[PDB]
RNA sequence: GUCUCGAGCCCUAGACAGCCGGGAGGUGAGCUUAGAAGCAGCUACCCUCUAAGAAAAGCGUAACAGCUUACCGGCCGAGGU
């Protein structure tokens, strides 16, 4: 339903393109609550059953793209 | 080594010299078991087969013995079925049972009919694009089965493009 | 005796304190 | 082909093989591209549910689909490699 993770993160990142290379080439930066927003749409869309664990999940596309955390 | 078959309560298996008969509600087939120091005998309700030897092929003989007796078990209750589908693309293949003989006239628009004799007490029954072979012996089915499809073969021509003939669609 | 069948032992009779073998073999215990 | 002898490893906490079932989500990863969604190329290859299940080992498609390998469970039961 919701959209996809890829282009959640791209909004609140203020940027449009990833890197060719992550972790290696930091595109953007999220806080810990931009995530935090980011687990609350993808409520359905994920298998977790604590917002814990929900975090997790996207924030495992963002290191592979250069979304640094802060 | 020994190895013990216990045989199934609808059939009752006897066994004289080299042969062993088995007869089931599905019929009887008969077959000779003869290898280098391989005893197989009816020990009541169970078939036994046994030797003194244990080296390769030895071995290899118990196990086709097995296998083969085993089969019979299965062909005189449960029998052997084989299913064939006859496909066509230009020539109408007509494929008939005449006799104890299965004949296909018109193969790829050949004026000689092609034929095979069946083998023993199978049963070959067509319902239109299908044929189902049938009996209690599984060599003789097979074989009937296969020397149909053999019936077929062409090495004249590209086979991708000249696929007439009929096939094995189900084997048992 | 690997290691990973004694600790699933041990976390499925943790479960049940709170392979059909390890469960079984958890339920002897 | 077959006979004999040795070493290592796995196995009744069920091995090897076969058969049945599962092979899941974030997500069709990002990039490149009109498109590429395991599988053209480049880079990375991360975490959830869980008994398993790759950012996919091999086919397959225009791209999907589809078919299976890995991996887990059951059936079986004795040696296997
Ligand atoms: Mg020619």
């Known amino acids: 339903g919701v959209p996809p993770t890829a282009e959640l993160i791209k909004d609140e990142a203020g940027f449009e393109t990833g890197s060719g290379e992550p972790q290696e080439d930091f595109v953007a930066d999220l806080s810990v609550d931009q995530v935090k927003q980011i687990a609350e749409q993808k409520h359905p869309d994920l298998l977790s059953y604590d917002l814990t664990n929900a975090a997790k999940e996207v924030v495992g596309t963002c290191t592979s793209l250069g979304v640094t955390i802060e | ?172 | 005796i690997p290691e990973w069948k004694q600790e699933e032992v041990d976390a499925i009779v943790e479960m049940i304190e709170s392979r059909n073998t390890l469960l079984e073999r958890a339920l002897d215990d």
């Open chain 2, 1 to 172: 080594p020994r190895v013990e078959l216990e045989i199934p309560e609808d059939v009752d298996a006897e066994q004289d010299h080299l042969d062993i008969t088995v007869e089931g509600d599905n019929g009887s087939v008969t077959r000779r078991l003869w290898y280098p120091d391989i005893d197989v005998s009816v020990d009541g309700d169970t078939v036994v087969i046994e030797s003194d030897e244990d080296n390769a092929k030895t071995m290899s003989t118990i196990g086709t013995f097995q296998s083969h007796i085993e089969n019979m078990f299965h062909g005189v209750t449960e029998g052997w079925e084989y299913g064939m589908e006859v496909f066509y693309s230009h020539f109408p293949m007509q494929v008939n049972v005449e006799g104890d003989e299965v004949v296909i006239e018109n193969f790829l628009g050949e004026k000689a009919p092609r034929r095979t004799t069946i083998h023993g007490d199978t049963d070959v029954e067509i319902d239109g694009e299908e044929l189902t072979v049938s009996g209690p012996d599984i060599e003789a089915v097979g074989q009937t089965a296969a020397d149909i499809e053999q019936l077929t073969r062409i090495n004249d021509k590209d086979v991708r493009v000249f696929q007439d003939g009929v096939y094995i669609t189900r084997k048992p």
